[PDB]
């Protein structure tokens, strides 16, 4: 409905969103953080390389305990990165949906770039796990809302 | 068990009948607040106590 940020030129922009997606919020934020201000064509190939374990998504904020890899040194010097395929899959579907919206609007798909993308925490879902001495603890999931906007690159 | 009294079997039959979803047309009545069957029972989760 209403996105946190509005495109500068509504006529030259398309958008898509997803709500209550069953994917870890922290992993998806890192993936989104790596795609901001990126051309649509490069973003799609970049996410496909993540699914192929050829390029890594750097982890900058929610990175405690994350392993170190050479595939992330170009974007993140200290080398912390991962390959969150599940987050990449949801974002890839959103990019394709936004691209189809561009075609209906007759935009130049070759010049589109990610002008806005953010991940918000959705309602937590509840399971439980069993602990020693007959105790029950929460076993929660952290789904997220995702919204993105693609804008044409103005000359 | 296989060996069961008539009385117990009759009670179990009634519990099976009550363990169904509400009809869909119930939620379309005027001034309806029944959202679902709040007394659903699963044989493995909650026991009948008899």
């Amino acid at each position: 409905v209403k996105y946190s940020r509005e495109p500068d030129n509504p006529t030259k922009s398309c958008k898509s969103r997803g709500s209550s997606l069953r994917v870890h919020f922290k992993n998806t934020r890192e993936t989104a953080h790596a795609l901001r201000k990126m051309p649509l064509d490069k973003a799609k190939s970049y996410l496909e390389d993540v699914l192929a374990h050829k390029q890594a998504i750097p982890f900058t904020r929610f990175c405690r305990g994350v392993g170190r890899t050479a595939q992330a040194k170009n974007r993140h010097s200290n080398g912390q990165g991962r390959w969150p395929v599940k987050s990449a899959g949801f974002i890839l579907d959103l990019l394709k949906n936004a691209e189809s919206n561009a075609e209906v609007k007759g935009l130049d798909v070759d010049s589109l770039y990610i002008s806005h993308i953010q991940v918000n925490e959705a309602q937590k879902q509840r399971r439980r796990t069993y602990r020693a001495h007959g105790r029950i603890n929460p076993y929660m999931s952290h789904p997220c809302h995702i919204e993105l906007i693609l804008s044409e690159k103005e000359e | 068990p296989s060996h069961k009294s008539f009385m117990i079997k009759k009670k179990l039959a009634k519990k099976q009948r009550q363990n169904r979803p509400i009809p869909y047309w119930i939620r379309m009545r005027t001034d309806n607040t029944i959202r679902y069957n709040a007394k659903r029972r699963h044989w493995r989760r909650t026991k009948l106590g008899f």
């Binding site: - | 009385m7 009670k11 106590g49 008899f50």
Partner: protein
């Protein structure tokens, strides 16, 4: 062994369903309901449990016969007559 292992032996029923009150409270060996004291002629009631009294007191059930007494009282328990046929 007093804990989890002991809970494994739970296949003998102390109480069954009471013929009178319907609770799973009929102690089999005592032949006595712990909830209503069946087969004792009088029901089991104690003033030290207000909640227990109101769970089982009159009006909590169907009042199959008692619900119609007030209506019959208003007519002075009239019987053996009918309204005059409509004209």
């Amino acid at each position: 062994g007093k804990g989890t292992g002991s809970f494994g032996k739970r296949r003998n029923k102390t109480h069954t369903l009471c013929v009178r009150c319907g609770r799973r409270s009929f102690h089999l060996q005592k032949s006595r309901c712990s909830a209503c004291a069946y087969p004792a002629a009088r029901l089991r009631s104690y003033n030290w449990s207000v909640k227990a009294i109101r769970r089982k007191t009159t009006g909590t059930g169907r009042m199959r016969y008692l619900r119609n007494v007030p209506r019959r009282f208003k007519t002075n328990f009239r019987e053996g007559t009918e309204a005059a046929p409509r004209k």
